Design an enzyme around this catalytic site. Structure first.
Site, short mmCIF file in Angstrom:
data_model
loop_
_atom_site.label_atom_id
_atom_site.label_comp_id
_atom_site.label_asym_id
_atom_site.label_seq_id
_atom_site.Cartn_x
_atom_site.Cartn_y
_atom_site.Cartn_z
N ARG A 87 0.81 -1.22 0.00
CA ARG A 87 0.00 0.00 0.00
C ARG A 87 0.85 1.28 0.00
O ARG A 87 0.61 2.20 -0.80
CB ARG A 87 -0.95 0.02 1.21
N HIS B 248 4.20 1.67 -0.64
CA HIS B 248 5.42 1.79 -1.44
C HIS B 248 5.36 1.31 -2.89
O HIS B 248 6.29 1.59 -3.65
CB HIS B 248 6.59 1.11 -0.69
N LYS C 94 1.66 11.85 6.56
CA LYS C 94 2.90 11.07 6.69
C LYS C 94 3.99 11.96 6.09
O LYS C 94 3.84 12.46 4.96
CB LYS C 94 2.84 9.71 5.99
N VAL D 67 7.29 11.63 5.17
CA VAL D 67 8.16 11.17 4.09
C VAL D 67 7.71 9.79 3.63
O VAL D 67 7.39 8.94 4.46
CB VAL D 67 9.60 11.05 4.58
N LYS E 193 19.08 1.03 8.88
CA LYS E 193 19.55 2.24 9.55
C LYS E 193 19.60 2.09 11.07
O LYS E 193 20.45 2.69 11.73
CB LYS E 193 18.67 3.45 9.17
N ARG F 289 7.71 14.09 0.03
CA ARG F 289 8.08 14.71 1.30
C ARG F 289 7.18 15.92 1.54
O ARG F 289 6.93 16.70 0.61
CB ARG F 289 9.55 15.14 1.25
N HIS G 276 9.28 -3.16 5.12
CA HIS G 276 9.64 -1.79 5.50
C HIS G 276 10.58 -1.21 4.45
O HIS G 276 11.48 -1.90 3.98
CB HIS G 276 10.30 -1.81 6.90
N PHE G 277 10.34 0.04 4.04
CA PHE G 277 11.25 0.72 3.12
C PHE G 277 12.27 1.48 3.95
O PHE G 277 11.89 2.36 4.72
CB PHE G 277 10.50 1.71 2.22
N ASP G 278 13.55 1.16 3.79
CA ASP G 278 14.56 1.73 4.68
C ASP G 278 15.16 2.98 4.11
O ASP G 278 15.30 4.00 4.80
CB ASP G 278 15.68 0.73 4.97
#
EC number: 4.6.1.18
Length: 124
Positions: free
Chosen positions: A10, A12, A41, A43, A66, A85, A119-121
């Site tokens: 959803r 990314h 949100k 970013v 990270k 952003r 998760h998008f890092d």
């Protein structure tokens, strides 16, 4: 609730376009993917590659996240992405985004069976 994998999809995935179509892309997508519902949100990145290509990243270059987690993977190749952003006079519920298109390696965290992105890092 959402599974971690569905939430990644959803937030990314956008395989419907090769790249952001306009300067308004992030405003439209952040809203329609329900990322401005409870707050703006701040970013968020969308990937314009097939879901299969993005899932495949979990079998690519193992790197640290990270935060020090060890289940992150960097795509061997670059991918078409769009960084969204918050900018300007963005104030919930009047959310506003800057659209930045790019071609970069993505870094995702993976989990589960099947082992898929959750998760998008970052992108490099």
């Amino acid at each position: 609730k959402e599974t971690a994998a569905a939430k990644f999809e959803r937030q990314h995935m956008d395989s419907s376009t090769s790249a952001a179509s306009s300067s308004n892309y992030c405003n439209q997508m952040m809203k329609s993917r329900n990322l401005t519902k409870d707050r703006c949100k701040p970013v968020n990145t969308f990937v314009h590659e097939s879901l299969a290509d993005v899932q495949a990243v979990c079998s690519q270059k193992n790197v640290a996240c990270k935060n020090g987690q060890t289940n992150c993977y960097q795509s061997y190749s670059t991918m078409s992405i769009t960084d969204c952003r918050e900018t300007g006079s963005s104030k919930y519920p009047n959310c506003a985004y800057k659209t930045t298109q790019a071609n970069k390696h993505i870094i995702v965290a993976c989990e589960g069976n099947p082992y898929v992105p959750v998760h998008f890092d970052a992108s490099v």
